[PDB]
Design a protein around this ligand. Structure first.
Ligand SMILES: CCCCCCCCCCCCCCCCCC(=O)OC[C@H](COP(=O)([O-])OCC(O)COP(=O)([O-])OC[C@@H](COC(=O)CCCCCCCCCCCCCCCCC)OC(=O)CCCCCCCCCCCCCCCCC)OC(=O)CCCCCCCCCCCCCCCCC
Ligand SMILES: CCCCCCCCCCCCCCCCCC(=O)OC[C@H](COP(=O)([O-])OCC(O)COP(=O)([O-])OC[C@@H](COC(=O)CCCCCCCCCCCCCCCCC)OC(=O)CCCCCCCCCCCCCCCCC)OC(=O)CCCCCCCCCCCCCCCCC
Ligand SMILES: CCCCCCCCCCCCCCCCCC(=O)OC[C@H](COP(=O)([O-])OC[C@H](O)COP(=O)([O-])OC[C@H](COC(=O)CCCCCCCCCCCCCCCCC)OC(=O)CCCCCCCCCCCCCCCCC)OC(=O)CCCCCCCCCCCCCCCCC
Ligand SMILES: CCCCCCCCCCCCCCCCCC(=O)OC[C@H](COP(=O)([O-])OCC[N+](C)(C)C)OC(=O)CCCCCCCCCCCCCCCCC
Ligand SMILES: CCCCCCCCCCCCCCCCCC(=O)OC[C@H](COP(=O)([O-])OCC[N+](C)(C)C)OC(=O)CCCCCCCCCCCCCCCCC
Ligand SMILES: CCCCCCCCCCCCCCCCCC(=O)OC[C@H](COP(=O)([O-])OCC[N+](C)(C)C)OC(=O)CCCCCCCCCCCCCCCCC
Ligand SMILES: CCCCCCCCCCCCCCCCCC(=O)OC[C@H](COP(=O)(O)OCCN)OC(=O)CCCCCCCCCCCCCCCCC
Ligand SMILES: CCCCCCCCCCCCCCCCCC(=O)OC[C@H](COP(=O)(O)OCCN)OC(=O)CCCCCCCCCCCCCCCCC
Ligand SMILES: CCCCCCCCCCCCCCCCCC(=O)OC[C@H](COP(=O)(O)OCCN)OC(=O)CCCCCCCCCCCCCCCCC
Lengths: 98, 171, 120, 48, 110, 175, 105, 80, 347, 48, 41
């Protein structure tokens, strides 16, 4: 397929596997998730600009708005977790084992 | 598939309007007034044929009528036009509003020596009509035959023969 | 399956060609069973709130029965409509494609040979 | 069918449950050869 | 290209002034100083209110991102629709501010 | 080299995602995602989507990664590092960035031009300026038609942002 | 369940951003306006199952307009043969490919 | 309605100015005699080429030249 | 929570699902999922304990990853089709990623690892919303993209869902985890028949929602969250002792109850398509679900009865809980098998 | 150029239609120098 | 059914809530006054 799109998808999959491999923090998970959003923005933008398709120019702005509202929701969840425990560690989030 | 058919380099030779963009923009309204008919024949041919290869002779007529326009400027009103496009050419955005006295002198000499009235605000953006002697392109997209649609339903709606027929449900 | 049929007239619960069909009678055994479901919902509604089950809330049990019969009448009308559409589409498709639905030759049993398997 | 019925049972004896997988692995391996015989599709293509 | 050349010039001047301002006083052999705060050593206290003003910033900033194509939106042929949606976006930003008011959200950093 | 600037910025973009995705800390991860957002914004700006790249800088890096860094600073308690005199505290920084940019150069090796020169992207890559648009940006007018054409999109987006304000004020109150 | 409320109520909520050949601001066409219009007018109303095999040619033309894989492959073939004929030496570039001839308009 | 208004203009004049300006911005363009001219100026701004029509023989309103009398007028815009 | 804010947020949940259902554009699908997730998060944090915050965090992470994979599927569709119509997809990569994203949204296995934890952490009403209303939007998208869905992928996810939702319910005493593994098994049953007859998918979805809402309404009406606390119901409210358990005999799928209707119609429509091994093995695993849920039925209307003394004080108070539609849902979840050919209304 | 390569047709359209397709950047400036390609494909984007 | 790895799981609480400071600043002399504050935000 097309050349720069392979790079943007590869960036998406690297940030996916970063989200799919937790090390320590919930903030690193939100970072990998929003890197996924960034790569989606770049890829949608490059397609819509390449196609000269006019009415989808407003699409990546809406992607950015909805997913940054999503990220605000994730930061508030992380803050409530960190006020419960003291740290935002993912191993403090394991009370639902039983 | 098939060989794409291109015109020869002798089909593409025409005398070029070798002037700059400010020179074109300075005579723009008089060009739209005076060279109206071959320009509009060409743009009708261009939005109807949808192909630059079927429009070459009308484009040559456009280039010819543009050259005759600028020769007719050159024979009569060379110095007011040069004074006007120099002042148009100084500007970065090439403003008309910075150059009203040179515009007035150019329009004065052109209306005196040639009788060309500069078009009013609104005229050059009108949709005009063009009389042509070429046929209308019956398939400009070169679409092949369309697939035959699925047959619709017709006839009245009789009830279900012995109901739902779901294993033992008699209705 | 039949989603391409009701796409040209979307979100019609009962189309205008449903009215060529006879409606279910009010003595329909399916509708009588739905009224029985309304009566059972009324009885459970008195039972779960600790009321005398056959006595309390006759207005309430009667609205239960009436509501289930009222919904189930239009449900049975749509059911009859969709099976009528199924059979109409089937018969028009058999009539339109004869080469895929040939009449198979029914041979009498004097020519039809079956292998006999004795039980002994 | 009997060929994989032996080889699945011997797979149970090298599994670790010894004669339990003999009635399980060989009975699953028997279905594979019978499926290859009579064309049995578990992931069947939608037709109707 | 001229933009990127100017950005590279500004970055190189900034890094050069940072490099000079770090390396020029280190040529001094001044002294090796021994043993180089209001709280003693305790943890950073989390403040819920600073986080709330950061999120309120982010949400009104997304609403501003919706508001940005309005000088281009004024040029349209469907002006009644455009004016209605512009007033509706600024009204929803105002309704967000009013809800942020009336739930004591803008308090002690009002 | 200068023709291939979009491909080069994409390679920098993938390397920056490898940078923060290995997750040394959320603060260095945030720094790597800021750098990656800047170079991916450069990818967008080198097609001619200038409003969309400025939306990246103004909104993504300008609000959202600000709030990410702001929230990250209110957790993950800081601790010092090496601070020996200016060879160690800045010369190691310069050598580390020199190794990083030499890695950016070193991933563009003969195993890479086998993918590049076989499937040559430049020559025909950015076809955005193919012919004339006119006295407008197509990208700007498509974004501007959010108000005339995109009525339902404005309604659902503004309602989701109002609901986002309400939702954050509910789940952060803790009551 | 696709509850087609937009076609039931006669409102347009999102059909306008759906395709490239729709009504665009200032009548800007997409790069593949004609190819998508031909694919849509081929595949209209006949169903997807007939459309995948009866309108395959219009769809291959439209996908090759979108992605230009055959065109990039042909250009890479011509340019790599040109590189081979330069390095072997049996070809020399003309003045209009070295920038020496003061272009047409 | 007049005691409350003076009370809120005494307490909170910032919000009174805000609601008054926003109310004027809402209900004022519906009352203006120049709102139609914004529409008429925006639809008279020629971003595209005025693609001409094939003259079939009966179009007495479509002109043949810009300086022909028939066609849309912008004399209202030069005069105002 | 302020009840006006609760009503506005529940209308935003419903509005997000309706936006997924009615829209023809993929961006509006993605918007409807974003709105649905954003709005359902405060319903989970309604009580503000650490378990609900942990459950909301895990739910946010899984649904957010699924939304990103959904948008990547949409973007690959725009590559290979240049358009945005919600219909079939034009790349097996986009079809695979969208099937994975919708399977993550449904909690189908192997993306099932959030559903028992999140259902455990949140209250019973929000668990009801998560196991009934949140299933509707991804099943609608799977209904509309079924010309593109890979058969082997959806059948693998369906059998892995039915097997893991079966073997999850052995070791459980928490009722919400039991309903979550029942959810995983039933979503496997729904997506098994999707590429053969999606009307049977809609039948299984509607009957499952009725039975699930009956079970969660009974769990709210008895204030029971565990098996051990459900077993005190006979000394407190004896009519609840039979309704919970014959609804639970419906949920496994057992005639003459209406929960046998979906699995029987699925087996019926998959053997038209010459698949005989697959409905047999899926319904054997449904019998494994019956095995564990019948053990729970024994524990509640049989052996482990014993009571406490403060039941003597609960006897003097009737219920004031609005057991809304509970007789209607209990009659619909049990006595609807004679009305089985009503399923044509979903065609 | 394309003489030694067998089975080649010069000016072969990659489309199945005979409709005029608008030429891509590399169909026009493809065999040209890199300075013309720079001024063609990043000229307006990089202009000041 | 408790195996080895699940035998040390205590059951969750009945109401699903679990068993779960303020800043102190020393404004030193750096008129001269030392203030030991107790802040609450
Ligand atoms: C009829 C069937 C449905 C009845 C539902 C309500 C039952 C009820 O409340 O009974 C109480 C009431 C008698 O009780 P009561 O003296 O008033 O006071 C109650 C006591 O206080 C009771 O005291 P208590 O409850 O406090 O404590 C005792 C305790 C003792 O219990 C225990 O300790 C445990 C129970 C023992 C173990 C479990 C036994 C089995 C229970 C479940 C049934 C399973 C079989 C069903 C099939 C398999 C399902 C898996 O519990 C009970 O005894 C419960 C009372 C009710 C028993 C019956 C429950 C029926 C509901 C479930 C079945 C129906 C729905 C599902 C159907 C499934 C598919 C067929 O019974 C009735 O009223 C029965 C109806 C009698 C008159 C019928 C008139 C018919 C008129 C027809 C014409 C008019 C309508 C026309 C319609 C069409 C128009 C077009
Ligand atoms: C079409 C689809 C319709 C779906 C059902 C819609 C209603 C239920 C859902 C919403 C809800 O909870 O409403 C409250 C709900 C009561 O919920 P509840 O907690 O179960 O009731 C307990 C006691 O009945 C509470 O008793 P109460 O002491 O408070 O006062 C008596 C009460 C007060 O009555 C009223 O308030 C009614 C008068 C005002 C009406 C609105 C005026 C504005 O009357 C009743 O509740 C009598 C029973 C009403 C029928 C309930 C079931 C309806 C049928 C559901 C569909 C069944 C489909 C079976 C299909 C089988 C084959 C597939 O319904 C009503 O209050 C009125 C229902 C009206 C049904 C009309 C049916 C035809 C619609 C066309
Ligand atoms: C001149 C103008 C006025 C004319 C008026 C004429 C009538 C005057 C009287 C007005 C009232 C009419 C009532 C309906 C007509 C009779 C329907 C009938 O018998 O159908 C025979 C029907 C088929 O027999 P057939 O000889 O082929 O047809 C004779 C007629 O042509 C039947 O006609 P068809 O072949 O066209 O029927 C269509 C189709 C025929 O059926 C079929 O195609 C076969 C499939 C039927 C469903 C099988 C499901 C099996 C799995 C689930 C089993 C559930 C558990 C069983 C019940 C547990 C206890 C609740 O029906 C269905 O599929 C509907 C589903 C079954 C409901 C039947 C009607 C019930 C109404 C009253 C319900 C009261 C509760 C009774 C218990 C609930 C269950 C019945 O028999 C059965 O399916 C066996 C069950 C017995 C039927 C219900 C008997 C109704 C009277 C009950 C009195 C005792 C109540 C005691 C208290 C409550 C229970 C504890
Ligand atoms: C943009 C703003 C303007 C530009 C920046 C300033 C312009 C002037 C730059 C040169 C200033 C002089 C050198 C730096 C100051 C040195 C002062 C000092 O402490 O010297 C003693 C120091 C140390 O002398 P010392 O050996 O006596 O050390 C004293 C400290 N004990 C004894 C405890 C060890 O001298 C040096 O370090 C010499 C450095 C080189 C001198 C300058 C060379 C030419 C540079 C041009
Ligand atoms: C609350 C919402 C109030 C404003 C509703 C939209 C106002 C408007 O001008 O809509 C016209 C616009 C567009 O109508 P129009 O008249 O501009 O259409 C002309 C056609 N075009 C766009 C091609 C130039 O929107 C619609 O008609 C459909 C979208 C909105 C439908 C109503 C949604 C209500 C949601 C409530 C929750
Ligand atoms: C023994 C009980 C379990 C098997 C049940 C088989 C039911 C049935 O209709 O079998 C006929 C079917 C016949 O299928 P069929 O008829 O579709 O066969 C393919 C089509 N022809 C006839 C052209 C060859 O037998 C099977 O499918 C065999 C495998 C049964 C399922 C696997 C059982 C595993 C253990 C439990
Ligand atoms: C209780 C019944 C209440 C029914 C209210 C009316 C709803 C309605 O009009 O629905 C329209 C719908 C038919 O619309 P259609 O577009 O053909 O179906 C989409 C299928 N994917 O019709 C249906 O969806 C009918 C089935 C509704 C079943 C609801 C109860 C189960
Ligand atoms: C219709 C057009 C669009 C209207 C909406 C958009 C307006 C643009 C500006 C947006 C403002 C957003 C925030 C508004 C919040 C209002 C509620 C509020 O602030 O209540 C508290 C306040 C008292 O202040 P307090 O709580 O004490 O604050 C500490 C400092 N003293 O109480 C107050 O100050 C009372 C505020 C309400 C009363 C103001 C009345 C002004 C009337 C002007 C004339 C009418 C104008 C036409 C519009 C209709 C107004 C009703
Ligand atoms: C193809 C299909 C297309 C779609 C068709 C329609 C689909 C319907 C899907 C139904 C999904 C139900 C979701 C849950 C109910 C939503 C409303 C709600 O939030 O109810 C819970 C509410 C919470 O109140 P709260 O204050 O939290 O109480 C806790 C104690 N303080 O109140 C309570 O807790 C009160 C206790 C009783 C709650 C009973 C709720 C029953 C709702 C389901 C009814 C049955 C489904 C409809 C019929 C079948 C439709 C398929």
């Amino acid at each position: 397929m097309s050349l720069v799109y392979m790079n943007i998808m590869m960036a998406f999959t690297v940030s996916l596997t970063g989200l799919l491999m937790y090390r320590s923090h919930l903030m690193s998970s939100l970072l990998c998730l929003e890197g996924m959003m960034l790569s989606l923005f770049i890829l949608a933008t490059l397609m819509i600009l390449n196609s000269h398709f006019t009415l989808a120019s407003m699409m990546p702005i809406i992607l950015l708005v909805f997913a940054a509202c999503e990220a605000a929701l994730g930061l508030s969840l992380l803050v409530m977790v960190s006020n419960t425990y003291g740290t935002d560690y993912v191993q403090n989030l394991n009370l639902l084992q039983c | 598939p098939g060989i794409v058919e291109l015109p020869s380099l002798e089909d593409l030779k025409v005398q070029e309007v070798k002037v700059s963009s400010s020179v074109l923009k300075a005579a723009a309204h008089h060009y739209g007034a005076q060279c109206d008919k071959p320009n509009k024949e060409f743009m009708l041919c261009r939005w109807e044929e949808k192909d630059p290869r079927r429009c070459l002779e009308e484009g040559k007529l456009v280039n010819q009528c543009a050259l005759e326009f600028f020769r007719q400027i050159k024979r009569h009103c060379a110095e007011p036009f040069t004074e006007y496009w120099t002042c148009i050419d100084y500007s970065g955005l090439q403003l008309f509003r910075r150059c009203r006295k040179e515009q007035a002198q150019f329009d004065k000499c052109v209306l005196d020596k040639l009788g060309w009235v500069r078009p009013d605000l609104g005229e050059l953006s009108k949709v005009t009509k063009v009389k042509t002697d070429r046929p209308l392109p019956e398939n400009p997209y070169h679409s092949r035959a369309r697939p035959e649609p699925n047959p619709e339903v017709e006839g009245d709606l009789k009830p279900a023969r012995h109901g739902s027929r779901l294993f033992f449900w008699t209705m | 399956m039949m989603t391409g049929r009701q796409a040209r007239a979307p979100l019609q619960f009962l189309p205008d060609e449903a009215r060529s069909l006879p409606p279910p009678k009010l003595t329909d055994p399916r509708l009588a069973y739905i009224g029985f479901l309304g009566y059972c919902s009324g009885l459970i509604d008195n039972a779960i709130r600790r009321r005398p089950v056959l006595s309390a809330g006759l207005h309430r049990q009667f609205l239960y029965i009436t509501s289930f019969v009222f919904v189930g009448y239009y449900l049975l009308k749509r059911q009859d409509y969709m099976y009528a559409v199924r059979d109409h589409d089937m018969f028009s498709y058999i009539k339109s494609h004869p080469e895929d639905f040939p009449e198979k030759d029914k041979k009498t049993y004097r020519e039809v040979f079956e292998e006999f398997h004795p039980v002994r | 069918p009997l060929n994989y019925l032996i080889g699945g049972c011997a797979g149970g004896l090298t599994l670790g449950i010894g004669a339990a997988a003999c009635a399980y692995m060989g009975l699953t391996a028997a279905l594979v050869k019978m499926g290859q015989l009579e064309g049995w599709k578990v992931f069947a293509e939608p037709k109707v | 290209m001229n933009l990127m050349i100017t950005l590279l010039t500004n970055f190189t001047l900034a890094t050069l002034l940072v490099t000079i301002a770090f390396w020029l006083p280190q040529l001094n052999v001044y002294s090796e100083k021994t043993s180089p705060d209001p709280m003693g050593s305790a943890r950073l206290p989390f403040s819920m209110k600073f986080f709330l003003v950061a999120i309120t910033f982010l949400l009104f900033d997304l609403e501003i991102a919706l508001l940005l194509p309005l000088p281009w939106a004024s040029q349209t042929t469907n002006l009644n629709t455009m004016l209605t949606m512009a007033l509706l976006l600024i009204f929803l930003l105002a309704v967000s501010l009013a809800y942020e008011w009336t739930q004591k959200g803008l308090e002690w950093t009002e | 080299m200068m023709t291939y600037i979009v491909f080069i910025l994409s390679i920098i973009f993938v390397m920056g995602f490898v940078g923060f995705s290995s997750k040394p800390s959320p603060i260095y991860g945030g720094l790597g995602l800021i750098v990656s957002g800047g170079v991916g914004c450069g990818i967008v700006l080198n097609f001619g989507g200038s409003f969309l790249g400025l939306m990246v800088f103004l909104i993504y890096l300008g609000g959202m990664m600000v709030v990410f860094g702001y929230t990250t600073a209110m957790a993950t308690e800081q601790y010092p590092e090496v601070w020996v005199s200016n060879k160690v505290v800045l010369g190691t920084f310069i050598t580390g960035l020199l190794m990083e940019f030499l890695m950016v150069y070193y991933v563009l090796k003969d195993k890479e031009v086998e993918i590049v020169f076989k499937f040559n992207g430049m020559g025909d890559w950015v076809i955005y300026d193919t012919g004339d648009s006119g006295f407008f940006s197509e990208e700007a007018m498509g974004i501007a038609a959010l108000y005339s054409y995109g009525t339902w999109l404005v309604i659902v987006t503004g309602w989701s942002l109002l609901i986002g304000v309400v939702v954050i004020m509910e789940i952060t109150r803790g009551n | 369940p696709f509850f087609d409320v937009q076609k039931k109520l006669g409102v347009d909520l999102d059909h306008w951003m759906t395709i490239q050949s729709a009504e665009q601001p200032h009548r800007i066409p997409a790069r593949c306006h004609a190819f998508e219009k031909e694919w849509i007018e081929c595949a209209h109303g006949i169903g997807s199952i007939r459309a995948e095999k009866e309108c395959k040619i219009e769809f291959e033309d439209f996908r090759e307009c979108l992605l230009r894989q055959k065109t990039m492959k042909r250009l890479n073939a011509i340019k790599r043969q040109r590189d081979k004929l330069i390095k072997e030496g049996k070809y020399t570039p003309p003045p209009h490919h070295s920038g020496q001839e003061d272009l047409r308009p | 309605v007049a005691a409350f208004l003076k009370n809120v203009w005494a307490k909170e004049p910032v919000l009174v100015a805000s609601f008054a300006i926003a109310g004027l911005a809402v209900i004022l363009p519906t009352l203006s005699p120049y709102t139609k001219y914004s529409l008429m100026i925006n639809r008279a701004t020629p971003y595209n080429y005025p693609v001409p029509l094939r003259d079939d023989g009966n179009m007495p309103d479509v002109p043949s030249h810009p300086q022909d009398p028939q066609g849309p007028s912008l004399e209202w815009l030069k005069r105002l | 929570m302020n009840p006006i804010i609760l009503i506005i947020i529940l209308m935003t949940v419903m509005l997000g699902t309706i936006i997924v259902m009615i829209s023809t554009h993929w961006l509006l699908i993605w918007i409807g999922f974003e709105m649905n997730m954003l709005a359902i998060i405060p319903i989970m944090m309604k009580k503000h304990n650490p378990r609900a915050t942990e459950a909301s965090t895990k739910y946010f992470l899984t649904q957010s990853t699924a939304s990103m994979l959904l948008m990547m599927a949409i973007i690959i569709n725009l590559m290979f089709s240049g358009q945005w119509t919600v219909m079939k997809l034009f790349n097996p990569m986009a079809s695979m990623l969208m099937t994975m994203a919708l399977a993550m949204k449904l909690g189908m296995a192997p993306f099932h690892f959030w559903v028992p934890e999140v259902t455990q952490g949140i209250p019973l009403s929000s668990g009801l919303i998560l196991l009934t209303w949140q299933k509707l939007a991804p099943m609608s998208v799977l209904y509309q993209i079924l010309p593109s869905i890979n058969l082997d992928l959806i059948l693998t996810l369906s059998i892995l869902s039915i097997t893991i939702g079966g073997w999850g319910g052995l070791n459980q005493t928490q009722l919400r985890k039991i309903m979550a593994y029942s959810s995983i098994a039933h979503m496997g049953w729904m997506t098994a028949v999707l590429l053969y007859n999606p009307t049977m998918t809609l039948l299984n979805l509607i009957i499952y929602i009725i039975m699930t809402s009956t079970m969660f309404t009974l769990f709210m009406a008895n204030s029971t969250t565990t098996t051990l606390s459900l077993s005190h119901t006979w000394n407190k409210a004896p009519i609840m002792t039979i309704l919970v358990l014959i609804t639970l005999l419906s949920m496994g799928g057992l005639p003459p109850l209406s929960g046998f209707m979906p699995k029987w119609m699925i087996i019926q429509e998959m053997t038209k398509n010459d698949s005989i091994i697959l409905p047999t093995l899926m319904a054997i695993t449904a019998l494994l679900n019956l095995y564990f849920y019948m053990r729970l039925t024994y524990s509640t209307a049989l052996t482990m009865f014993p009571s406490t003394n403060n039941m003597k004080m609960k006897w003097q108070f009737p219920t004031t809980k609005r057991m809304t539609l509970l007789p209607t849902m209990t009659v619909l979840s049990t006595m609807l098998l004679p009305l089985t050919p009503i399923l044509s209304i979903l065609e | 150029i394309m003489k030694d390569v067998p089975g080649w047709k010069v000016g072969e359209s990659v489309f199945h239609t005979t409709r005029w397709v608008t030429p891509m950047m590399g169909e026009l400036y493809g065999l040209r120098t890199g300075e013309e390609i720079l001024s063609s494909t990043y000229g307006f984007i990089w202009y000041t | 059914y408790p195996t080895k790895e699940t035998a040390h799981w205590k059951p969750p609480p009945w109401n699903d809530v679990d068993p779960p400071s303020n800043l102190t600043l020393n404004f030193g002399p750096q008129g001269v006054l030392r203030l030991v504050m107790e802040l609450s935000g």
